[PDB]
Amino acid sequence: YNLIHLDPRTREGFTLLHLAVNSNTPVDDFHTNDVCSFPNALVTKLLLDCGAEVNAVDNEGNSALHIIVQYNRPISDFLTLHSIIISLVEAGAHTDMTNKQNKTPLDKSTTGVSEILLKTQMKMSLKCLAARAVRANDINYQDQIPRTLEEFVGFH
Amino acid sequence: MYVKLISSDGHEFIVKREHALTSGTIKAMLSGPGQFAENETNEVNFREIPSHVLSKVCMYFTYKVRYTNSSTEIPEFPIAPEIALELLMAANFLDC
Amino acid sequence: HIHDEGLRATSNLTQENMPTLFVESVLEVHGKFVQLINTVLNGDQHFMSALDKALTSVVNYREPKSVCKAPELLAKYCDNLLKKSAKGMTENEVEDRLTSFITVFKYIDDKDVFQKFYARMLAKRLIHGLSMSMDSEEAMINKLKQACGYEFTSKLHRMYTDMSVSADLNNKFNNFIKNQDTVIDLGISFQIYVLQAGAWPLTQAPSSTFAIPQELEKSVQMFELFYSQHFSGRKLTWLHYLCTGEVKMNYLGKPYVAMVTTYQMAVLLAFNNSETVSYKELQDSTQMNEKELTKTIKSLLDVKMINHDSEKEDIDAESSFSLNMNFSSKRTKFKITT
Amino acid sequence: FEVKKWNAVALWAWDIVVDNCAICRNHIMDLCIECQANQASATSEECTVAWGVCNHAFHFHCISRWLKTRQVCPLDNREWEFQ
Amino acid sequence: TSLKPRVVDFDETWNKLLTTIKAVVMLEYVERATWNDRFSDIYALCVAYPEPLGERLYTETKIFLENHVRHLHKRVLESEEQVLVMYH
Ligand SMILES: [Zn+2]
Ligand SMILES: [Zn+2]
Ligand SMILES: [Zn+2]
Known part of the structure; x- marks a missing residue:
């Protein structure tokens, strides 16, 4: 919890949660490959229990949910994909969060398993549909909505 | 089983009660000293939501109840450009 | 224990420099017991809350059938730190001794009384120029804003x-005087400390009533025009008793200057036309109440610039005074304090 | 024995009892909240007082920022026009 | 009136809100119109212009709670042998 509140940031903007769910996080050639294999369900769950910023955004734009859904092994270790997906979603994750390239996590999936597994967790909301409609047609929302909605519109 | 959502203009949008409780505040507005367990009116007075956007909220309620578990290429919700940014804060107030 | 420790550290003070002793004693107790809690009791939150509660019961320790001395003592401590004096403290020293002071201030629990007392002392230190550093006043005001809310x-x-904004007002007034139709005669050097009613604890209460002297009515008129043209919709009421002016006594030897309040200044006007002036002969021009006139006359008789022609030195209906031509002062800057 | 230097002190009120920028909830004669921050860049004079026809007072920055989207006076919901 | 951020005076809305939250924590009777009108007051405070008063609303509610349960604690402790039925 102390380290999470320190809020570390890798040169690519990867927070502590982004690395725990990314399969691109390197593990050194020693015996750590036998145990410390990423993404890990237990590591992500422990980070979320310690108040990790689930909606943290790197400089690329990907949230903690865009990074996982690009996982290239969705079947052999489907347990540690499903566990991280549900752990993210039930804590604070915004399933419809739009990165800097206008990509929904469903768009940046490249996998049917992750796409439909996330769709099973996507609680549709009128707030998200209205945010998408506001962003798509570029309505000037400055100071005409609550401030928390302004960053919410920025999310979509 | 029919909650009556009044609007800022008096447009009483009577909707199915199970449909309306998909929103948090309408679930909360009927919870507590607003229950009125007599199935007579069960009315809700939105003194800050215009009728034209409360109607879209009610269409959203019906749309969500219908297409919750389907996910079989659900049709896109028609939000007019002018009524957005009113629907946005309406759904902020009436959460989901 | 902490409670009793406070009663063995702050209740034993006997007058003297109590403002610098009460706060210092409470700070010493706090520093001893927060060091002990942090290094022995692991800095536990419950024990820190116990410390804060005990010191809350210690700082504003109310003697039965009496008001707590904590707000006035803390206000006087801040006054003594901020007021310029020969204590030799620097800006860093008074900045440190006020940052540590806030630890005592948070336990007052009677912040309104401290606010009234601090306003009363700040008014004096800002009007009479007793402030050491204006930046120090700003720092102390800002620290209380960080402690409790802005409305405080x-x-x-x-x-x-x-x-702070008085030199700019005076500069603008001088600019208006220069660029206002003809060259208005500046027979006086008029610097004004304009204040906001409701902000300052000063209350005019003009039941005493006063009349501005003739040589100052022109300045009043030109400043009224300046403050009605440059600024709009502002009732400028005049706070007479705090106005002071200097006078050099060229009537006798020209030895010194005689900085004196306006109420006592209006005494000298009638004495300027004729040396012998009676009580009502003075009062017809000032047109003030009997109490303030008697107080000013008594203060001037202590100054003894005016000598009582009547043998009865006590103030009565006649009460005719004159200019004491034999009176002289040791210094060349004979300021009359109140 | 004549007056040559004078110090004078005079109070002043606003001729209308107003005691807070209702937008900012700090006093109008104080700096606005927007100018409360970046006080080094602020000159502490730009925080002028703006008065409407409704005899309500706010800082110029505050009522200007409020007027960029809402054309109505913040306190009483009627149209706003400067003095 | 709409749901846009508007200028809200906390010291008056809270007083209009305290009379409801004080009567809903004691299970007194508050009319349905007032209860439905309060949901706008928390909303108005939480999106107030130009600084949301969610911190002020939460702090004042916490202060009221600690000044209400402590009032209940004195009453329960006031009764000597009935502290169980006064607690319940
Ligand atoms: Zn303001
Ligand atoms: Zn400003
Ligand atoms: Zn107005």
Whole structure:
């Protein structure tokens, strides 16, 4: 919890949660490959229990949910994909969060398993549909909505 | 089983009660000293939501109840450009 | 224990420099017991809350059938730190001794009384020039804003802002005097400390009533025109008793200057036309109440610039005085304090 | 024995009892909240007082920022026009 | 009136809100119109212009709670042998 509140940031903007769910996080050639294999369900769950910023955004734009859904092994270790997906979603994750390239996590999936597994967790909301409609047609929302909605519109 | 959502203009949008409780505040507005367990009116007075956007909220309620578990290429919700940014804060107030 | 420790550290003080002793004693107790809690009791939250509660019961320790001395003592401690004096402290020293002071201040639990007392002392230190550093006043005002809410230091910060923006007002007034139709004669050097009513604790209460002297009515008129043209919709009421002016006594030897209040200044006007002036002969021009006139006359008789022609030195209906031509002062800058 | 230097002190009120920028909830004669921050860049004079026809007082920055989207006076919901 | 951020005076809305939250924590009777009108007051405070008063609303509610349960604690402790039925 102390380290999470320190809020570390890798040169690519990867927070502590982004690395725990990314399969691109390197593990050194020693015996750590036998145990410390990423993404890990237990590591992500422990980070979320310690108040990790689930909606943290790197400089690329990907949230903690865009990074996982690009996982290239969705079947052999489907347990540690499903566990991280549900752990993210039930804590604070915004399933419809739009990165800097206008990509929904469903768009940046490249996998049917992750796409439909996330769709099973996507609680549709009128707030998200209205945010998408506001962003798509570029309505000037400055100071005409609550401030928390302004960053919410920025999310979509 | 029919909650009556009044609007800022008096447009009483009577909707199915199970449909309306998909929103948090309408679930909360009927919870507590607003229950009125007599199935007579069960009315809700939105003194800050215009009728034209409360109607879209009610269409959203019906749309969500219908297409919750389907996910079989659900049709896109028609939000007019002018009524957005009113629907946005309406759904902020009436959460989901 | 901490409670009793406070009663063995702050209740034993006997007058003297109590403002610098009460706060220092409470700070010493706090520093001893927060060091002990942090290094022995692991800095536990419950024990820190116990420390804060005990010191809350210690700082504003109310003697039965009496008001707590904590707010006035803390206000006087801040006054003594901020007021310029020969104590030799520097800006760093008074900045440190006020940052540590806030630890005592948070336990007052009677913040309104401290606000009233601090406003009363800040008014004096800003009007009479007793402030050591204006930046120090700003720092102390800002520290109380960080301790408790802005509504606490609303009037205080407004008083500080009023006293800060006075040179600019005087410069604008001089510019208006220069660029106002003909060259208005500046027979006086008129610097004004304009203040916001409601902010400052000063109350005019003009039941005493006063009449401005003739040589000052022109300045009143030109400043009224300046403050009605440059600024709009502002009732400028005149706070007479705090106005002071200097006079050099060229009537006798020209030895010194005689800085004196306006109420006592209006005494000298009638004495300027004729040396012998009676009580009502003085009063017809000032047109003030009997109490303030008697007080000013008594203060001037202590100054003894005017000598009582009547043998009865006590103030009565006649009460005719004159200029004491034999009176002289040791210094060349004979300021009359109140 | 004549007056040559004078110090004078005079109070002043606003001729209308107003005691807070209702937008900012700090006093109008104080700096606005927007100018409360970046006080080094602010000159402490730009925080002028703006008066409407409704005899309500706010800082110029505050009522200007409020007027960029809402054309109505913040306190009483009627149209706003400067003095 | 709409749902846009508007200028809200906390010291008056809270007083209009305290009379409801004080009567809903004691299970007194508050009319349905007032209860439905309060949901706008928390909303108005939480999106107030130009600084949301969610911190002020939460702090004042916490202060009221600690000044209400402590009032209940004195009453329960006031009764000597009935502290169980006064607690319940
Ligand atoms: Zn303002
Ligand atoms: Zn400003
Ligand atoms: Zn107005």
